[PDB]
Design a protein around this ligand. Structure first.
Ligand SMILES: O=c1ccn([C@@H]2O[C@H](COP(=O)(O)OP(=O)(O)O)[C@@H](O)[C@H]2O)c(=O)[nH]1
Length: 520
């Protein structure tokens, strides 16, 4: 006789895939375990448990589930793809890049692995701006530019009429994207603009409920094809469509590829070009996007004369403590951003201030394997591993509150942080950064320059060290900077929401004028 197993597995395996596509993680996981109880060499279920734990941040389990899936079926490109992403996210950038290469070698038309690879390069100093640029263009040429028509003249090209703005993202939720979009959506001038949001992910938390309520129109987009989304955007009559996700998120750039709107913009998540002809504008700022940078972008750079994001803090802000070995340095950035280049500098700072402690908080630090590897990485640079204190990730306000126990924040290179740096300043903690010759290494350099704190902005790695040393020694400059931030916080709490979105609206208007104008 034979067994009904194969049928039971298949029903569990499709149920598991539905559960994960709809957002129900705990249900997809338990179904994957049920498959492995019956058939523990099932590489499809190993793989899916791999993804889910990778999304949850358990990179230790994730990686070994995905490596076992690779061993059982090494020809399957998607198993290599997802292993590469886990490895990059865990801090092992070069090992992940290799895995991403394998996925492309096995399936040369893998558009998600090609993006992932493009993204991954920004976490490594080994790939210059020319290499990243080329790979992006290569992607666009393959998957985007074939779909793109020539720019048509806008419908009802009235330079002064009320404009419809469409925000397209798959991280409209408790997430940097959602955090910076909320103020913009609330403060948009309804006399001159109308706000459509296109949510490209099913996860709907308290912030999505707020974004939905603040939007004029909503639209849940994840179940639609790119062609279906295009005919939806066209029917809504969107004048300016905005890519909030970029290559880093659950984007919808093949819908953008077709030019459903006459003005198409990438903003907020972008750290480099999309590579696409179909993207007209990228919205940055004057410090963020350096003078000779434009040749690196298919989009036209829009250098706003303020910081490229709204800096007003949330209402539920923990509020500052009276302060409290000194000094405690801090870096609450993703592990992908903490590689060999940064660790070399952080070690040199810790040798020169032999009592100072470094405090990292990120996803993956719950696993002993990844915290051990980080401790050992520092000991190899002559720094005792006990001086390094690693913490598992926390809720937003709980994390904000732990800045009270930090004297100075350190920013990553070559991929500069952004929202962690802003969060630090909100809690009266100064941030030391390197200004890279590169948009991806300038999110903090810009922020700091626009907030008056140019003295915390190094142009060289040895200057980075010196600034961090200077702050660890002098209590006075710390108390000066803590007050500068107290005044800045209040100023930004009051004006910055409306001040920013007016400057952005000014940019949207000039994009629109120019679209109508050149039809004459
Ligand atoms: O343990 C953590 C770490 C981060 N975050 C939040 O998620 C964001 C992720 O920032 P990231 O680590 O990607 O660095 P960034 O790119 O903002 O510099 C932060 O701003 C925090 O608000 C959190 O809730 N818990």
């Amino acid at each position: 006789m034979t067994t009904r197993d194969a049928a039971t597995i298949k029903a569990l395996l499709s149920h598991a895939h539905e559960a994960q596509r709809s957002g129900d993680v705990l249900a997809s996981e338990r179904a994957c375990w049920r498959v492995l109880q019956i058939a523990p060499d099932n590489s499809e279920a190993l793989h899916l448990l791999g993804l889910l734990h990778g999304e949850c941040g358990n990179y230790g389990l994730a990686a070994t589930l995905l490596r076992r899936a690779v061993a059982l079926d090494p020809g399957e490109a998607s198993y290599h793809y997802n292993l590469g992403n886990v490895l990059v996210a865990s801090g092992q950038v070069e090992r992940g890049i290799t895995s991403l290469h394998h996925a492309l070698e096995l399936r040369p038309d893998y558009h998600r692995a090609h993006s992932g690879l493009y993204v991954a390069l920004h976490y490594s100093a080994l790939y210059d701006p020319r290499a990243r640029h080329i790979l992006a263009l290569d992607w666009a040429r393959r998957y985007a530019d074939p779909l793109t028509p020539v720019p048509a003249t806008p419908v009802d090209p009235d330079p002064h009429r009320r404009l419809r703005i469409g925000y397209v993202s798959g991280e409209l939720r408790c997430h940097p994207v959602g955090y910076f979009l909320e103020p913009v959506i609330e403060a948009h001038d309804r006399t001159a603009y109308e706000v459509y949001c296109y949510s490209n992910d099913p996860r709907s938390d308290a912030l999505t409920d707020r974004l939905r309520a603040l939007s004029d129109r909503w639209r849940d987009v994840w179940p639609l094809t790119d062609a279906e989304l295009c005919e939806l955007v066209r029917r809504d009559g969107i004048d300016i469509l905005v890519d909030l996700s970029w290559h880093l998120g659950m984007h919808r750039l093949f819908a953008f590829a077709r030019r459903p709107a006459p003005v198409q913009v990438t903003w907020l998540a972008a750290i480099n070009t999309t590579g696409m002809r179909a993207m007209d504008y990228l919205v940055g700022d004057q410090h963020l996007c350096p003078p000779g940078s434009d040749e690196l972008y298919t989009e036209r750079l829009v250098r706003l004369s303020r910081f490229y994001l709204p800096c007003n803090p949330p209402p539920d802000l923990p509020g500052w403590a009276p302060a409290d070995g000194f000094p405690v340095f801090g870096c609450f950035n993703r592990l992908s951003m903490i590689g060999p280049e940064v660790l070399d500098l952080w070690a040199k700072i810790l040798l020169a201030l032999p009592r100072a402690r470094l405090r990292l908080i990120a996803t993956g630090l719950q696993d002993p394997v990844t915290s051990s590897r980080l401790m050992r990485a520092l000991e190899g640079r002559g720094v005792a591993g006990e001086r390094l204190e690693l913490l598992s990730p926390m809720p937003r306000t709980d994390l904000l509150a732990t800045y009270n126990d930090i004297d100075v924040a350190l920013d990553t290179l070559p991929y500069s942080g952004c929202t962690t740096s802003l969060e630090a300043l909100w809690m009266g903690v100064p941030v030391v950064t390197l200004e890279g010759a590169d948009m991806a290494g300038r999110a903090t350099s810009s922020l700091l320059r626009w907030a008056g704190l140019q003295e915390l902005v190094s142009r060289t790695q040895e200057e980075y060290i010196d600034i961090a040393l200077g702050l660890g020694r002098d209590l006075g400059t710390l108390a000066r900077l803590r007050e500068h931030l107290r005044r800045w916080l209040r100023s930004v709490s009051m004006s910055d929401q409306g001040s920013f979105t007016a400057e952005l609206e000014d940019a949207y208007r000039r994009m629109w004028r120019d679209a109508c104008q050149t039809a004459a």
